[PDB]
Amino acid sequence: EVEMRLKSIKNIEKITKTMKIVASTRLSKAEKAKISAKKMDEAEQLFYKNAETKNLDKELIVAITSDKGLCGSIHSQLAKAVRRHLNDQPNADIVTIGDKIKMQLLRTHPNNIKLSINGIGKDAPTFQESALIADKLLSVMKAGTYPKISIFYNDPVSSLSFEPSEKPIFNAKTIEQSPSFGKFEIDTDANVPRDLFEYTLANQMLTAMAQGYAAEISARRNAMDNASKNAGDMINRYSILYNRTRQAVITNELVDIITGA
């Protein structure tokens, strides 16, 4: 049964290599998106720094996960934050994004998930797909009326130094009357506050989804990488056992044949 173990580990290693190639293919696009998305969000963040855009105070619960079903700690860490939010704010509506986050959000509170959209992590973060997702969110159940909304989003530092970290969003009320919003002026006719809330949600969502897709592609290159290491170690051990077993079998055969003679 050692031979079947070695060959099955070898097959798992081949499958892991194929998954690594798929990870590279998806990670190229995820990084390509995140590169521009980070700057896009920093553009409106400059305003949120130009005007201290602290939001005070029906409050949604969100998470970051692409269209894959967990990779090491890609879905688990976000699920823990989702359960913590469910405990803290049971009456908090959930935005079920992708599949793994969709399944995790459907797990805790049936009355929280207000949307169930799948396959968000199809490819790189696209501006139009993210924008349409937000516009639907900005139209579903008055998520703009949601006084506060925390984005429990991945913060991949370099490779996997992340969890679904929580951040605030400057909404329609919190944009116009920010304490340092006196710095940047708005127009009564232009209706700045609503548009600033929507666009802040847009930039934050695009940047966060791009970072999360990049981080899960990392989980497809930093969790399967650990699995590839495990397969290498198991394969070396099994190869040692089989090479020793074959040699010992041949030796015992020679010994038996001579001992017969």
Partner 1 sequence: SAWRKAGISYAAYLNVAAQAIRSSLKTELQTASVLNRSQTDAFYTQYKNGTAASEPTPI
Partner 2 sequence: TNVISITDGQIFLEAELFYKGIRPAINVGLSVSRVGSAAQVKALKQVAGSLKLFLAQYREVAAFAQFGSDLDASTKQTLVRGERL
Partner 3 sequence: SSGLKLQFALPHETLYSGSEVTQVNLPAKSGRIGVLANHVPTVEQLLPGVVEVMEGSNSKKFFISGGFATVQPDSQLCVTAIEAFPLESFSQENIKNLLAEAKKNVSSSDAREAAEAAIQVEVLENLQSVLK
Binding-site ranges for partner 1 (CB under 8 A): 29, 32-33, 96, 106, 110-111, 113-120, 122-124, 126-129, 131-140, 194-195, 198-199, 202
Sign of CA dihedral 209, 214, 215, 217: positive
> Is residue 242 within 8 Å of residue 3, measured between CB atoms?
yes
Cα–Cα distance, 51 to 48 (Å, whole number)? 5
Minimum separation from the CB atom of position 67 to partner 2 (A)? 9
Q: How many CA atoms lie within 13 A of 223 on its CB side?
A: 18
- DSSP assignment of 24-93: HHHHHHHHHHHHHHHHHHHHHHHHHHHTT-------EE-----SS---TTTTHHHHHHHHHHHHH-TT--
Task: Tell me, residue by residue from 28 to 67, as one string, x for binding to partner 2 by CB under 8 A and - for no binding.
Answer: ----------------------------------------
Scanning residues 64 to 93, which ones bind partner 2 (CB under 8 A)?
A: 69
If contact means CB under 5 to 8 A according to the sort of partner, which of partner 3, partner 1, partner 2, none does residue 247 touch?
A: none
Candidates 19, 186, 192, 235: give the one binding partner 2 (CB under 8 A).
19
The DSSP symbol for 122 reads G
Q: Is 235 in the site for partner 2 (CB under 8 A)?
A: no
Query: Residue 180 or 247: which CB sits closer to partner 3?
Result: 180
Binding-site ranges for partner 3 (CB under 8 A): 35-37, 39-40, 42-44, 46-47, 49-51, 127, 130-131, 183-187, 189-190, 192, 195-196, 199, 202-203, 206
Range 143-168 burial, b when 16+ CB lie within 10 A, else e: bbebebbbbbbbebeeebebbbeeeb
If contact means CB under 5 to 8 A according to the sort of partner, which of partner 3, partner 2, partner 1, none does residue 69 touch?
A: partner 2
Candidates 2, 15, 141, 250: give the one binding partner 2 (CB under 8 A).
15
Residue numbers at the binding site for partner 2 (CB under 8 A): 4, 11-12, 14-15, 19, 69
